[model samples]
Target chain A: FIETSIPEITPFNARTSSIKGKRLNLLVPSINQEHMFGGISTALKLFEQFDNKKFKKRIILTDATPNPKDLQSFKSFKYVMPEEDKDFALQIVPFNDRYNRTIPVAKHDIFIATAWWTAYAAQRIVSWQSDTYGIPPNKILYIIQDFEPGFYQWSSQYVLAESTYKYRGPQIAVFNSELLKQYFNNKGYNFTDEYFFQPKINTTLKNYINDKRQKEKIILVYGRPSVKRNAFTLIVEALKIFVQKYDRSNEWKIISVGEKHKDIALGKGIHLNSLGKLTLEDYADLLKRSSIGISLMISPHPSYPPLEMAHFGLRVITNKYENKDLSNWHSNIVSLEQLNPENIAETLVELCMSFNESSNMMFYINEFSFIKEIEEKL
Target chain B: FIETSIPEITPFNARTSSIKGKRLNLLVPSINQEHMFGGISTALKLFEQFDNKKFKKRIILTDATPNPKDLQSFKSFKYVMPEEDKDFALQIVPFNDRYNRTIPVAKHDIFIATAWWTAYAAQRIVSWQSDTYGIPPNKILYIIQDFEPGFYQWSSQYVLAESTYKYRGPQIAVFNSELLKQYFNNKGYNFTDEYFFQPKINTTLKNYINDKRQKEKIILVYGRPSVKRNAFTLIVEALKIFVQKYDRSNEWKIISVGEKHKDIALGKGIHLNSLGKLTLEDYADLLKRSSIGISLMISPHPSYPPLEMAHFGLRVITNKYENKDLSNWHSNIVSLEQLNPENIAETLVELCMSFNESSNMMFYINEFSFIKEIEEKL
Candidate 1:
């Protein structure tokens, strides 16, 4: 079960003697277009910063090997897709809960782990490499996007996921946000070296905000029913309370984006319409016209939707998690102190009663110069 | 969804006027014989401590109403079952994930919340009572057994469970253990008043520990596939590694107790036998003979099996969770610092290689006098 659940790296499979020159390997679950958006996109951006002259870039798929047709949809790194560009090296070692599967590695391979399971595999490989090659074991870089153990109940998977962060063989950690990094630090997870970057505003959304339209009595919800961290049920419950208490069915229109679900009938003759995942232009347009936004993420990471909504001049309603407070980031963002239907509903009522259609747009640009500083450290 | 997911308390449903004496109401999910163990048993113990001459003792079923035959098996409180004793006032307000369920209450009724959802319901009733009677709201006694929010992933239920602990209307908190109470305090959840009691040893198991026969080469594991906090998968994986690393197939016999599952085959011709759950006498017999035990609980509560095993003269291996360290409580207990298969297997191998068959029994008794102190405070 250990071999099946976590990939095994034995001496027989590690390939001690390989081709010359150092190699940079990125271990990711998948590169399908839908899965390539948030963390994977950021990982690829970091992977690209490594000097190609010193390290040969390689991509290893630990979970899935996308079909060529699906691979064609991925446009971030065209060369990494084997079918799109045959010259680049790609390895597909899918561990579909089976034992004795080999993961090919070189002596001088530097690894970047994208997920917890991938970090477990990368740690095993690095430990084996160090024991075989007699080198220091800090060759793997872990890109921790979120506290992955919170993705499950306190189960075997949760403990196993948490153990990856406390490995004896040290690894470099690059956190997605300083808030998330601080959460890790507070939890006493120490790494050999740590780096973090603040999330940058969506420039594409910022570009559409300058041509402002008249604010409508609309609330745009970042609703992803399939993603548990988004608290979709709580959003619907809060909306139900809001509609029943305010009785503004004819004045306000509620629209949901992100994932498609059945339209919900919030009381008082109001229905929440589902727009599913919208195009970038459509999302930006909706953000510009909508007066309020509700995007809840039950994680330490300051998720991007509320920030994107704030940048587009919408009064955003989100929840504070651990040390994450979106209200501190922007005046338009209202980070709720508590996450309950009654509290959220009362907040919505206050915001609706005091609705003012003023120029709330205050866009700030982050040049992302920290990327170059991190690259130099690498 | 709000009405269905969380039990709603409305003015029309909550009875403003009711019977005469000050009532002590215990709100629990169920009291079936199988469910009436551990926390439920402890709750019943506390409920009986209140003087019946001063307060009427009543039980409210929030999630279930047991059948008459199942009620016959309930021996803890004969008067609480309505069918068993018609004079007793027992209310069956099973939510069943539906709305408009009325809960009859009195102005002087004091509430004890057993679970998180029950706490939610109890808090609502207490708030309504305070509002209707024009009194400060601190009548509910929240008996927190474990951190209930950890039962689910970070989802709607997780937040809802957590919100119950942070209600604005203060409540009296009675934690099951001092360690769990400390964990809540560290997380900054303040209660108006707090009380905790140490776990008492099972006297029946203690009585069977004397006059022990020679110990067998048996490893007893507390395995429950349905309960995620037990980490059943990690135990199996660790046992597999142990069997492979130490060639002691003929010497060791692995037996799993608790909830049942199919027997698993480890490498080296060793198989893990599932005993499901055993009778108390049989369980005590097995505990007295077993030389080693493995029980993993990913929680702040120091679970009973490791302590039970240590008292029964077995060397036990368990995992340390948060601030919980069972090794400090008993010399026979080895709490693992890391909860991975490699680390757990190494510990097992070391224990197996240097097997000690001397008398390791050291039993301590807790008189549970703190219950009287809490009762006086009430």
Candidate 2:
């Protein structure tokens, strides 16, 4: 069984266990927009490849509504529909027995831990829901969305202890992106060799790369690491440097993308739009049109924007996180040690001047034939 | 150094190391007695053991308090003064830092993470004071006086994450008892191998324990783990069964010493007194004069009263957990599995007939040799 039921805690759902089909139910401690969009985009690829009567999804959301940003970003995940395949559906259930009850709707086939907060909630939900739901907590798979652990600017230790205890469960620990998976492993949690769930933004995004060249002005700094990079603070600090060292003659624009918004300074070419929530289509579109993609990752792992940006043939610039593999993948990309204002300003101006106008920008993205990798997962 | 300046926390000092012999000025986190008592006692013990110069201890007490039972039952490990230790400490820290900063104290040497709210204050004190006081956060240790992992009930996941990050840095952790110690260790926390910080008692307790034993008729039911045993319910059910089974012939006095004040009845001669905060001398006197000690330890891992009672030569009655060990170190102690009211009634009646006849009980108690062990610590 993939789930568990704990009746002791009333008004809670049981943990997940009833795996029935491939219509994978991406679970999180809660339901917010970004999860739905990115998740649906990935889910659509799987559905597009294996769409059948069995293709369906039940995204069990959590009641962790602390702010409007959650709802706003959460809306982003909900807009992507699975390619006219009625079999593919998304349903949001906020209050379940488990914190982020990853119950395999109908029967056990596939399950996913959608986010970190949901994983934390899964621990409690599993303990209480396992028996009632007849799903043992250990079998229910979980996902870590970020390497970032729970924290507060001013919260006390006791509060953190309670929150961690509340969300973390005995279920199979899962995580998304390389950072979160490794973070939990490094945090010393006793886990299985392979995480049962992951962050899947279809490898198909590689096809969106275009060879066309255009004006390079906007520096697209992807802030997918809202938890780690602190989208707002990092940019504010970097933006100041960019502004100070910014060449008065340069026509480069500073644009921030991905989740998180606070203290954004927009002046003239500097666009300070929340970008709020957007479908993966809109995200990719923005990536394609952007002049430069800046990687503002604080945690060691690179978030989706880095890969997505690269696939779109955008000139990419990243921070000093030691991911030589990424810098090796792209032609017009550059990686730096830090995103200080002076360095950011210098990098933007240099990348602008260095743009190869006539070359095939799409050729810059890493591409490997699928023949060898296809059978490994199978 | 045993103590560090909790700048912007404890008003009398900031950023300076405590002298080997100096009174610590502390700001009280809350007036809620139980949590503060443990912290106060811990601080006092550290201050006293660090040196012995007629120290002037200043303690800050909060205005908001928890339940009386929680307040009264908590024990202290050290004494400042029998009277109020300059209670008006926080009133002195200038306006902005005092009222707006809800934190309990600035982190310096170590902290007793006793309450959820206090833990929050501790975190801020640690972070803000670290920059202000020039002390690294890793130096601050957290003591879990009780098993309270359920701390972040009211806040977001971010708060919990931050608190755990802070706790992960502590050099050592102290638990109230071995039972709770195991709980934390299971979560992968490294503890000091043995329980160190305990609820302290006042000097008057020495004589009180001796005086309480003179009654020779009292039966003390240890209840630190009483809630786990379903103690009150079990007592009521068992007593009702005994009255019917024995035809109401038993006249034993079943006395329960616990922290709950609810109306949970046992039998005709049953006396239930929720021991709220009493003077230290009174508690020791109660434990000492008692003729019998009872341990309804559902979670087992026998806590203070059972051992303290045995030290006073009282025969003990207790419930067993799956792997309970009854090596009480005193041979005069008695052990029982689930002493329901009838079982307790029959046993109490039998004890009433046999207790208090021996003059050499002290010799039997001396065999345990805990005083010798504790004398080493003292």
Candidate 3:
């Protein structure tokens, strides 16, 4: 639940390619998480569009000590053939061991770098594979999901994470959103061989928005205090101001989700219902029940919760930092000038009023086919 | 020690008129601490220069529950007349009990704001005094040590702290150093009426520096994990790399001073000497013994340890962030470009080696008259 837009990453994990036969090798940090799974899902969906199934595709999961249970879970998806690529298997490789350079790889291997370390690993791997196995570096794909460096304080790790973007290698950048893509582009990144894909509202949640019933007087806050970029404290402060000013609206239940944290004091006698962690099902249920949402991310990447909550018909209040904008993306989202408590509190009250008056609230999803877009580009 | 440069301040504490009775009213958040003592020392020194014996000056030390022992200790300083302004006393005001605006004061009484909260209190008091007792707002003085707003993250407290700097009253900024003064000045602050005084090596420490013995092969680190600006983790990372690269230098001890923290491993069985919170005497003793010192502050203010260490003839390594430049100020200081582990390790090694080579290292003190500076300005 503390999963940040620019998330905490692992240490030096690379080398030992372990490519299985003539397969598409996905160089990912790990396999059992929302962000990783989302990345894998998109990669598989795009790979399915490839007409010639000359080779099978597999994931090269790199971890020092691979969890047995996680490995077993990934094994269940061994035969997830998607459309064309068949015999999918997860090859758990130990990057903890020193580089052997003995792990087998073929010439036609399609290497996909999923994370910052993996992207760095891919740069070196692509160069090595091209020199050793005569594989073309141009075939390697680097997945870009959020500015990874913003996760760390100004330190060594930050530089390493940031350097991956400017890796002088033959890897095409496939960004998660237009904002992310635009961010990198604005940073003087080469977009000549890049691809961008916007995240859609999950089908269940998208349908949940359309087939809605009476929305209750509740506000779902994407409260991940542990995550620095989430602006949890600022959000809490805004909510405190709101709660103090509008104590008459005692009927409105404020439930905070995302990460494990103590129940926050919201002035008066009301304390926030601290739901530390919740399953996806529970989160979706809460979203469906709630009439308003609060999700503030202090980063360039537009975090999923705000987009998800807004698309789910809840009048959402997010934030804008640097050049990151969600104003044009959704009408429901009231982008804050900064993390202003008074402004956020006022915005929350206005949203609550508008939500109470409005009977038929609609959130039409603007769909984009990544597979189709990548097909033309790839 | 965990004090932030960009301090978060309090609310409305200024007015149009000033009180310059024989008794000056100094508004401070607390008393009987290192930070408080430093502010008090400066304020008392400034008051002693004021030739006018306006009726005996007094201090308003506000705290919810003032410790009896601390109050007793403060009482000893009641008649600490020094050379001139002799009739000073301490008045413990309970802020926990509500501001009655009846704390007794008349015109010609000067007000000094010591901390962020005190600054806000000062602003409000100034306003009240001017309207009620005709204390001119221009007569109020704000002794800003660091950027108060920097104490907080991007939260409601940050706004409150930041707002104090722009109180829209006639309070003049009295800075601790030129670096701190320039910091706010560069931030578009109207410093037209601001006064700055550079820090000096303590007289005892300065004499101790002149009467130094043979230094030990030690590197003292100002390590405080709880303080974000201290860059404790970064220093640890740098030390780890340094240890790994130079295992031969195990004889040179790595001693950590600041808040309580577990013993840190620096690889190859070497652990940092975890001297949690050390007494000032012990710190001074360590400074006298140590050849090299690391005080990496990830903030704009030139943190004291590095300066103090450098003044004691130790080759000191500190950080430069935004406008924080200590290069020209201290000859013995090695200012970091960034918090890079490799760079810090290399710098530490270079400093250690240079210290070993140089037999007669010297650090000349650059002192400024704080009383004279404030007198001219006020």
Candidate 4:
């Protein structure tokens, strides 16, 4: 059984052996954007290839649903289109019983921990006395997304999130990128033996590419106010300087994405236009039309906004951390030496001017080999 | 030498080595109550023993000052009163220069990391490649007062706090109690080599103990809403049952301490009287007068109020955690098997009734020798 009923959280040995037939149980913290859904969608995509074995897939949420109104939507893994073949029936464990003390697993089943919190829970589930406490899986799998401790202020959560990497267990790691994998490996997480998967852009964007690369003298900035890693403050400050230099004609269309906004003062005479979060098609459209993009993430993994924009022939600006360099990947994707407003502003001026002449630069659609790599790795 | 000075955090070999005197640098997040002030006061008390020579003491700030108006109050370790003794000519390093890249340390001086954040900074302080970065410390000293990750929600801060314990370095831990040391050891922290000092009580409280303890039939509850581990909700729930069980005459005064508050309804007819924070003399007076005390801390390290009340001849009741048993230490200090309201309420009824026949209970001042243990350990 790929899907199981929402059973009560009881002592493992007391529970009925309903999950004995499942092949895989995916334990996740939540279902939403960024790492959570990215990992989910990617994992689901991989499981789609296992139709020959009719592998059972179940998503066990460790955290409560963010929006309870549509628990079924997330529980069913809605990203997988109905038209696509389904091996096992899909079902969601109700949100109320999410934190049951003993997670029941079968000995033959494989468990996947999606996030740090889920990894901790999954580790506990696998470590329990399988023969006595409950049927337990032999190995736990981890889906490494980003260095999550960097998401918060230097505090308690950072340590717990970082500790997930130190856990000892029979496991496999699915890293989102070679850059993120190398980051943990260098810091002694030692993820060298893990599988690294390249980031993907929306396939629809490929249709919009052309030999004519004339674009708006506009900039698309990743402006998620809630997520601190975007370095919105630094980006805003850089734009303040850029407006003074480039806004003489008042021709640049300065747009923000990823979240909703009202208006922001870049300088005395300039205001920033916010586009908020965009649908996939809207984002792809905007990426192809825009000439420059700024998507800064203060972590070891390179974010997708800059990658997608560069792939679509836009001159992109992003920052560099420990092992997150992108210079070798694309010539147009400029990496900042430091995360200061002054340096970013200087780079913005140099790149916009230089790229204006060679607007017809070839689109860098590299890493299309990821689909095959993931197929082989999984 | 137990104290040091506030020097710059810069690359080492490039700078001149002017600091030749014996000094110790203490890095702390803040100074006030609970974890922060407890660590600060203990560190200051340790430095008071270094009067044989003028040992320089530098109290570095890791978190911003809550009240920046009196910067010297925290910067100079002001809790160590002027009359006690001045070992060195203390100079406060302004809180403004706290996070400078390189933390300057002399070869002879010691560096103490007081809180988790400071421990991280201290770890970095000691790791500096002296030739390129700031001066490195000989070793890192951590004053472990409690399990710090318990301070926050299971979010980003919690993980970061937990990460500090896993840090590998030339470090020595100074635990506040054997219970706390055992907790970290059980959790794979491996703090076995660390020194564990007994829990201390106020010197004034010890003076008020009597053979005949006819105390007021009142209960003093350590109540701080802001702190989570204190288990304010659990204490309130238990008080509700206590009032129902024995409030026929309504004479038992239930007073709350540590924070200011309005009246809270314990039940349909009962209410709690909040005294907020008190001066030391007032606290001692209240402790000496109260007959029963309820101070529940959910963490491994038992709090001070229960010990102080037990020392002042009150029958104190505190909840027991994995390594926080108090049964062997003091007969008067009753430990609860469970933290639920029913168990707590049952214990209160039993203890109050049992002690009523012989109300003159002897004071349990077992840890009076903690001062000596600390002196020997240091």
Candidate 5:
């Protein structure tokens, strides 16, 4: 965004005029694209919430693969999101390391193990790295995204699950939700952070509105489409009934906007789309366009999306099997059962009838909005 | 009778009047003879109502046999048949050397295992036999029962059945019932003496009803009857129904009736003509003249004639079960159930009765018995 005509960080590198040794690194693991699932983008919005001393902190990001092209996308953000907002305080350092990221992270009082690779890197930072560099392991706090030893990659999961140092002494571990905290507590390890609360909102959809186009009612389901983790079968059953009611003029778009999505290619039955490779800017825009977002955090820990759905002013339909604390979205919650086509088929019909341009569907976003829990879990 | 017959010390040697040192002996072992058919006779009644003098306190018995025959008979006499007078003391001695009854017992606190062979010979006050001549190990009283090694028998049935001797240590032991005390207490040692009571009773009975008692009533059906145990045969089957109506008197008498017995012969079913091994003179004269004086205890323990025939003055029966403290006849007092039938056609009306001394029935034997169970248990 800075290389083009668009507004950019006018005061970039030289902004760190003072505040020495105030090293704050917001290091994320990788770039899981399809531009849709909003963990990284929403996490970055925390920068906008901070001061423009973006130089005061350094944000380290990694490549999902050896993608040198992705570096431009990481550093390309012009003026943080909207021209009206300028809350970036951290310098975004996007390094495309296919092997691993090792920048002798010294006593970073704030160390986040955000995403798969980051959690893997977290083991290195707080463990041997701290001992060798005298980083004082106590300062390294691991902000776990999806539960480490969790999905994403099997090896990352194994390291976090099998490596004792991942949750050992000296490192302050933060879970994305109370569920993760409880899980660890039950396993007899109180991860030394006094159980952090899941943040309630993410900047991407903190004060966002929904987009209206095509005059179609849409329900968005986010996250990957693994039966082992997601309850996608529940959504399909809901669609089967949606078609049964037989409404011609009134259209219902059942869209699953996620990463590693399965081929749910039953053609004329659903309108599924992926905002592929679209930068965080356009991705946020897609979220705003969706009417209602659904996610099944079928895992025991918290994931993204449902909270972001709330940020974009979309009602959330989520399953109860989540270990993450979803009480934030309890207000606009559509339970796993309620999202069935058989259940709200009448409401879908009602929406098709009264579909008007003036109505902001986001008016339905409450504390349960995806943005609210994004901040909490993050 | 023996004292009157030959009271003065008649030593076989030249100059022997006073005796040498009497090593105080003790005996305590299995004496429970309730409802059993013991294989031997030990003139138990002569010592039943134990005057301390008759008890041979110096040779007191101390046993850890789970079921002391004397105590069991004592319980029965004290509880079930009260009027029958019976008594004895269970002398306490060391408990150890469980099972090796053949071994010479050691000395302990002036006790000895009466279980030795020669102890019986010690009872005869003839001062006749030389100490080294026929004195068996039983006569050695200086040794205690040596019940030391903490009784633990190996047989599971005995162990599981909770027999007191299951896990038993040797004891300076003596069974109360002379039947067991004399014979089974040790190995095999029998000493029969001509008793004053025996002569008097037989003489009194013979003189009273010779012509009227020309018919023999109390018939002997003795021997340690196998029926006292083997539960799987005709005896049990017939006895089941017979026992139900047992209190009635129309049945023939099968009472032990002072009869000489062997193991119960199924062939001997209901016949009383054969008195095992008595001369015609002794059998005809003694039995025919006797109206009620006959009784026996072939047991399941022995000496059933104690007070068994009190139900039917002529016939007498006895089960093998008895408490050591209960036994012996006091005129017309005896347990009625101790009656044995002389003949069995379960419904036969005219079967011969075993003991025909109709007046000798001791049916009110339940009136005077009482058990100091608490003291006994302790």
Candidate 6:
């Protein structure tokens, strides 16, 4: 048999006891503090908006085990304990618990799928609930962070990931960005109910930019070797070409942030130093002083580092993926239509030749009141 | 630095001796007999037509080390030893030879890239040849087997794989199928010079199909558990649902061909037996007696098994990828637009409910003479 089989979910059967209130469950892969930075954090923000009096809020961990420490680390549980509200709770349906585990559901439950795999399980549960409980089939709130099928080859998992979006149930698509939503629409994936939120500029970084220091001849790279979509090898290759083509007397220093790795030599006494991940303060300070930035994401999500760097007035080089083009967002950003070492290196040389030291702050407003809009929808 | 760095290629320098006659080199990943079935076989066919007297033929293995035993296994080397032809040769530039090894190239040599990475290397060598020799740049004959970028996630490799198609030098694209060519065209990758050929029916299997036997209630699956694009898990999942929903009294037998794996249970006393890689005669015998066939390929190129099964008068179920639709190819073929267990199972149930014993055969003609066209071009 194949080592990777589909995770089978047990269908929900008729409940033995009467239902008390409507339960809103957020189906997420994990709630570990370290992993809850971007997409998971946004999911929690939506989960907390459901009024506790009318709807019982429960966070269901699909991939991870329910850990008390991790649950308490959530911003929602800071003031109130999870046990304070009897209906409010945490549930674990480990992904490996293929045919045995059942997700507890009420007569009236709203499922918000935070990831693609969770969406697969949630859709099954919703279908089973409709069949067993004789209740009206509810719409699933699908939080799409990226085109997840692109995360794999045209394999079984890739098709499975694509299948989640094609779920025949009523779905409300909550996209992370308008660009991502546009990308979906361009690919003919249209949902009846759709909502999108623009990413807000980091306030700490913005404030730090206001009190700027003199720019150095430094290039800061958003490096995450483990993450495939970040295009780490492409970045290094482009830098290699840039170092070879550029003048040796420039004395440019390259530093990598986000993840740690062994330092890479870029010829002519220059090396790409790894700073691992930095604190918010250190990150802001570095962005303020860096003259150039290189952050590539081979997805339509318009990843934050390039935008953050552009907001800090650093000449940034990033890639345009599908419907995403960040160059229009700021003058400092250079969004490459093609992603190869030659094109990237040529662009870098042009940027280096015309290097300027002037801080340009981007004024972004979050027009979509996410909390209010989500609460109103519920 | 990242663990996965780009493979460095040494540039071709100025030659000291006078230029020789035209030499044609085929760049392939491997020449092992086991891996030389489909794409490599076609590549060798084109390489053989390059006029051995006028144009010397050489096979360059990009990934595999040069081996005399393995070279002898090739059909081209059956009568003639590799050492007999001094001009004709084999070269090895292992992919891991990052910065050291150099490829032996003649001033008037032509390169045919058989795979994506080899295409990357070929393009670089062509560019370096133009700069070093001051000769008119020649077009690299790129053998487009499949959209290779789908072989990885949106990673550095994916982008690099995509970059080969966007080479700035003159390129002649030779696609395996018209469907794949259309897929590329649909995606806005318009090639200046393009050629496509239709897949021919297996004559050995066709002759065997003329004398048919009583059809059994058997389902033959084209199962390669290791290849991701084949959707092995999806096949198993669909079979599980098919067994559970279909009548248990049908006494149907399920057998898997291609690669070997442990037998998989499909419920109600039915199991998918692994036949491993069958011999040509055995495969033909199995296809002639089988009632149904399931061969899924998540690619634009229509895989051979489903077409072969349909030609042998067995009802076949396959998946449509991008612009590829095989339903019109034969009356016995059912091409699914959506790839999911539910849809697949429902179709299987419908087919089983209306089972037919009558046989349908397909007649195919190869219109494009690949050997003749390649020779004329050269």
Per-prediction DockQ: 0.51, 0.03, 0.09, 0.04, 0.00, 0.64
Per-residue CA lDDT of model 5 for B58-86, tens digit only, reads 22322333344455554522221111211
lDDT of 2 by residue, B246-318 (tens): 5433444445555545433444554444564455656676766677666654443455555556656677665
Candidate 3 lDDT by residue in tens digits, A1-378: 211112223333223334455565666655554334445666555555543345455666554334555566556345231122333443334343334323345555667777676776566666776776554564567778777766654443455566577566566788877678888887676634777776666666665566555689998888776665676766776787798787555768898887766776677777778786676677778887888998887657787888878766788888776578777677777787545566788988888788652321233353334545544443
lDDT of each: 0.76, 0.44, 0.64, 0.61, 0.37, 0.75
Q: What is the C-alpha RMSD of each candidate to the true structure, in Å?
A: 4.0, 13.8, 8.5, 13.3, 41.7, 3.8
Report the C-alpha lDDT of model 2 over A348-376, residue by residue, as the tens digit: 66766766322223433332123123213
Residue A315 of candidate 6: its Cα lDDT? 93
Deviation of model 5 at B77, angstroms? 70
DockQ versus reference, model 6: 0.64
What TM-score would chain A of each candidate receive against the reference chain A? 0.88, 0.58, 0.78, 0.79, 0.54, 0.89
Tens digits of per-residue lDDT, candidate 1, A302-373, equal: 898988888777888999988888787788899987788888888888777767523232334433355455
The TM-scores of all predictions, comma-separated, are: 0.91, 0.42, 0.65, 0.51, 0.33, 0.91
Question: Candidates sorted by TM-score, descending order?
Answer: 1, 6, 3, 4, 2, 5
- lDDT tens digits by residue: candidate 6, A74-119: 5453223222324444333333343443444676777889778778
Which candidate would rank higher by TM-score, 1 or 5?
1
Docking class of 6: medium
Ranking by DockQ: 6, 1, 3, 4, 2, 5
Name the 10 consecutive residues with the lowest summed lDDT in model 3 chain A.
A1-10
Question: Model 2 compared with the native: what TM-score?
Answer: 0.42
Strongest candidate by TM-score: 1
Candidate 1 local Cα displacement, residue A118, angstroms: 0.3
Report the lDDT tens digits of candidate 3 across residue range B1-378. Answer: 211121232233322233333455666555555444445666655645644432345666554345566566556444221122332343344342333333544555567777677766666666676777644564567778777655554444544455567666777788877778888887666633777777666666665666555789998998777665676766777788788887466778899888777787788888877897776677778888988889876556676778788777788888766677677676877786544566789988787677651321233353334555555554
**Interface Cα RMSD in Å, per prediction:** 4.2, 16.2, 9.4, 15.4, 45.3, 1.7
Which candidate number would show the highest lDDT if scored against the true structure?
1
TM-score of predicted chain B versus true chain B for each candidate: 0.89, 0.55, 0.79, 0.78, 0.28, 0.89
